[PDB]
Design a protein around this nucleic acid. Structure first.
Length: 447
RNA sequence: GUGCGCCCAGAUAGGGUGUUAAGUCAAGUAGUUUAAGGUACUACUCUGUAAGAUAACACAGAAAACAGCCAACCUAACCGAAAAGCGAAAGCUGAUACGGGAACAGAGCACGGUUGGAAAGCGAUGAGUUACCUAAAGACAAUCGGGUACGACUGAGUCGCAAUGUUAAUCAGAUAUAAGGUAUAAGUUGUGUUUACUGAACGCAAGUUUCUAAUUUCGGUUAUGUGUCGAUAGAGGAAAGUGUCUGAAACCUCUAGUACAAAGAAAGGUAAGUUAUGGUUGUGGACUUAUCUGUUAUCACCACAUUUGUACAAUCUGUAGGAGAACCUAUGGGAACGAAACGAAAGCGAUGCCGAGAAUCUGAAUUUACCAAGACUUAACACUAACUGGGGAUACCCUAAACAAGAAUGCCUAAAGGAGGAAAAAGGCUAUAGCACUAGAGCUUGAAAAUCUUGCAAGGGUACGGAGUACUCGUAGUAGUCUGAGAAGGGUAACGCCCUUUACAUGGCAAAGGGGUACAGUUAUUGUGUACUAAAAUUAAAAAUUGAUUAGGGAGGAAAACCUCAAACCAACAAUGGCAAUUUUAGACAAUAACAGAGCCGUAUACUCCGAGAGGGGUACGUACGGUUCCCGAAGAGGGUGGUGCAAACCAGUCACAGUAAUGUGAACAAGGCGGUACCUCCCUACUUCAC
RNA sequence: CACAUCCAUAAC
């Protein structure tokens, strides 16, 4: 079992100071242990979790390994490796998976380990937030609309998290709250094995077929620990930046950034210099276009998919700042998903879906609907209904033109306007399309 | 696998087109007028003027037939069928009988015909089943205070446009490749539109098209309307504008949604320019230009929304770079900063191709000055189709023809006798129990007339919808001097074009649908290549040696300060050494089966729709013959070689039982035979809808 | 600040 790793991270040579916490995880320390014994050591067969939405086929130990895996069944566990990353259908912090080896079922538990290890008192917002809470896309609304009484949001381009992975100070940091000074080593002899194959003998990965569940949280540690070190100067940075523009809370994602608080471009040079120093020194990656693209006040320019202002024109601001659903993406997949054409003026138009021959009709409406519902979270807290309403008109008339050009009678757009949908009152029926669409608009937006 | 389409002959079986011999047909009424000539003019009646009401004249017209819509009825044709029928039968065969009856597309072959002027369709709504709200803020109340076009919601009354087009009028000639407009493919992939491909055909040249706007509220707002916030704009607004009171001196409509000026400032209606498009090409609403007989008579105007001139404003009006948020410079509200979609494009040029008003200016032009072409009918001819007429291999379903067939029955008294003593299984013979049998079962019975059987000849149907390259097949007749030509050609273009010489009979086709033959191309399976020649990013190269290397041990149980449990180590940076595949240096390939239609370009023709006309959209890529890439159909249901278990039952002794054999047997998924449900199927089938 | 929509018919 993982009893080794139990004795490893639990014990952690605690005769002098030890695994991360120093006053606040003593009677909260075995909090993990008791239940990792019951959850991360769920059971010895097919038990913990897996990939058929709970776990794969039901074998006996998990198949045979973990009990004696103390004796390192897959000792080296070479785990052949290539690269992979998929453009997440919007606002991609593109997420990594691992080439299929049901050692998968090993690493998933092996990293529920690390999840419960660091996250429990410390590591905040698994998979791209900043502050600690128990949800995915919540800081990236609330902290945005929490403070920010300033201008000059500083975007970020270079990855530094994946195409610059350390692999030396990587472990050097990983073992700063897991393994101890004395008698703790037995983990990473395979963690080091992102042996990518692109005509070289690299150890660096771009997707670490070692596993996909963890590479998010590995990257998250990569950034998360040392964001404290780089925040240590932020800890005195806002002497007057909050209080210079005044007279009448970092921004940590997986990938992209902006400095929290601004008072001056001279108050911004400190960013421009230090946040380049540390990232250079520690991360072994360096940033782009001279700290970046520093907007004077505002732009219709992206950030994690969300603009911030500090006929596609309904923005606001004032004494207080806010959020806005910008253009780019709904110029990008608005056009690649074959919603619009601009090649007739009167800017865009619902013309139809790409396919001449298309799938079934419940299929059509359902995949269209899920596409829309794609708005439901991403385009949550947002101004600019009428923009989205242009979007929605094009989308709806696209789905109706689609089910039209499938029936294909006499420009079946009219008879399909009339025969089902949301006014024909009909299974040939799905009355959720667009009222629920402006429902998803109104809420998660004003609440 | 689109209603038909195959390929070769003519062209009323029924037609289409073209041009010629013509005719007949109506032009509001007359007039000189030609001759039945024709809108020319004189007179006359009606007709139109609202281009924005009135009357008077000047101008635009007066019909007729075709096409063509529209509805309504009536009946061929097309229907499962009647109904007859042909080895019964697989399937075929509807004078007329229900149902449809314009059949969906007629866009290359018809329903046809009578009536009437009118249908879908789109904007303006009758009617019938809703919600608002209401100047006060509401409350109070359908108090019709004071309503419903804010609309429902459903189902159709009333108008509009569809609901008209089409036919000649005195003749040139002039800026006649003029500006404009068309073409040059498609198609694939480079996706940064940066000059690349295809066995394009063209030729020059990469940001072409669009848009980031409007000056003293067109401010806080869109691609509608709407309402509420604020700067300029309240008598009311608590003695309720029907009632009622309270809550503000704020709260409702409105203004102060420019300062004016300058001309127009309404409906429609006519033609265009578009928008409508969007995916190809035509008909209905929305915008712009302009047009809608001149003057006297009341009529005949307040507006109104917009150009222009700016006048200053307030939002803070891209830009370049600054720029506490009440921030600025400068070009100040395109003032290339750009912004986007946007790949041998746009743009540009060439060559080719088009030209009515006969542009506006001259000789115009003479019995109002010259006119013979709309539609039907008729003569003839050239032409043409998917029509009509001829021609039908290759693979399939079936029925008899004992045409040829593997198939004809038991025991006993006792082979004799036979069973012609006796039965009755056997084929049947019937119904029908029924899960096949068992057919039960008297019966002919003791072969026949029928397990099973593939077939002579033959009965029928499906395939005539183009994919890469030769050959058996029905024709070298049904085509003869092809147009893909013999045959030289010669030229040319992607070739096939285009035009010259030219052999008279197996030249030309060696007609079509369809198979396999042979290597191809692609999608699928197993296998192989994997040096015809070695090394290389080095994948093996965390190896080893490591480098003398680095803090770290076996299994487990406890917070952290660790406590218990039993009693020499593998990893830390790598180099390094072989090959493994193809990168990288070079004398994966086998075997299996199946194979379908997106076009586009030229030549000849068929049609239709849009257009001055070149041309663009269609008809299976129109259709065949040449070139080409792009591209390698889909499900469902029968069927049958073949399968696959599993409940029941099955029969004579397969088993038992006794009987003359049957006979009565209980016990058969001990299935001996043998089916019903069964599985994943196998393969075939345009089988039926789909994809074009 | 906002609510919401406005698009035919028909030739493959």
């Amino acid at each position: 079992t993982m009893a080794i790793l139990e004795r490893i991270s639990k014990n952690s040579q605690e005769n002098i100071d030890e695994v991360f916490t120093r006053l606040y995880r003593y009677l909260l320390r075995p909090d993990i242990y008791y239940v990792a014994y019951q959850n991360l050591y769920s059971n010895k067969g097919a038990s913990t979790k897996g990939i058929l939405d709970d776990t794969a086929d039901g074998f006996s130990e998990e198949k045979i390994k973990k009990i004696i895996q103390s004796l390192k069944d897959g000792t080296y566990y070479p785990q052949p490796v290539r690269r992979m990353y998929i453009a997440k259908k919007n606002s991609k912090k593109m997420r990594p998976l691992g080439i299929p080896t049901f050692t998968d079922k090993l690493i998933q538990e092996a990293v529920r380990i690390i999840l419960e290890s660091i996250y429990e008192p410390v590591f905040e917002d698994v998979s791209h937030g900043f502050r600690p809470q128990r949800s995915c896309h919540t800081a990236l609304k609330t902290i945005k609309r929490e403070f920010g009484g300033a201008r000059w949001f500083v975007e970020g381009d270079i990855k530094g998290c994946f195409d610059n992975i350390d692999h030396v100070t990587l472990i050097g940091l990983i073992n700063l709250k897991i393994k101890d000074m004395k008698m703790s080593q037995l983990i990473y002899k395979f963690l080091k094995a992102g042996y990518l194959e692109n005509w070289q003998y690299h150890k660096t990965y771009s997707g670490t077929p070692q596993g996909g569940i963890l590479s998010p949280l590995l990257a998250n540690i990569y950034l998360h620990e040392l964001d404290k070190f780089v925040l240590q100067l932020k800890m005195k940075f806002d002497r007057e930046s909050p209080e210079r523009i005044t007279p009448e809370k970092y921004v940590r994602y997986a990938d992209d950034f902006i400095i929290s608080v601004k008072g001056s471009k001279e108050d911004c040079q400190w960013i421009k210099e230090q946040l380049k120093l540390f990232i250079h020194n520690k991360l072994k990656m360096e940033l782009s276009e001279e700290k970046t693209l520093i907007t004077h006040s505002s732009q219709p320019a992206r950030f994690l998919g969300y603009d911030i202002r500090v006929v596609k024109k309904r923005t606001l601001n004032g004494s207080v700042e806010l959020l806005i659903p910008l253009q780019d993406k709904i110029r990008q997949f608005i056009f690649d998903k074959k919603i619009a054409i601009q090649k007739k003026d009167s800017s865009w138009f619902p013309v139809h879906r790409k396919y001449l021959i298309r799938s079934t009709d419940l299929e059509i409406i359902t995949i269209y609907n899920s596409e829309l519902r794609g708005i439901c979270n991403y385009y949550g807290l947002a101004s600019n209904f009428n923009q989205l309403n242009y979007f929605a008109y094009l989308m709806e008339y696209s789905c109706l033109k689609t089910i039209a050009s499938k029936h294909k009678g006499t420009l079946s757009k009219t008879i399909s306007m009339f025969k089902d949908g949301s006014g024909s009152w009909g299974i040939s029926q799905a009355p959720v399309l667009y009222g629920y669409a402006r429902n998803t608009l109104e809420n998660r937006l004003k609440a």
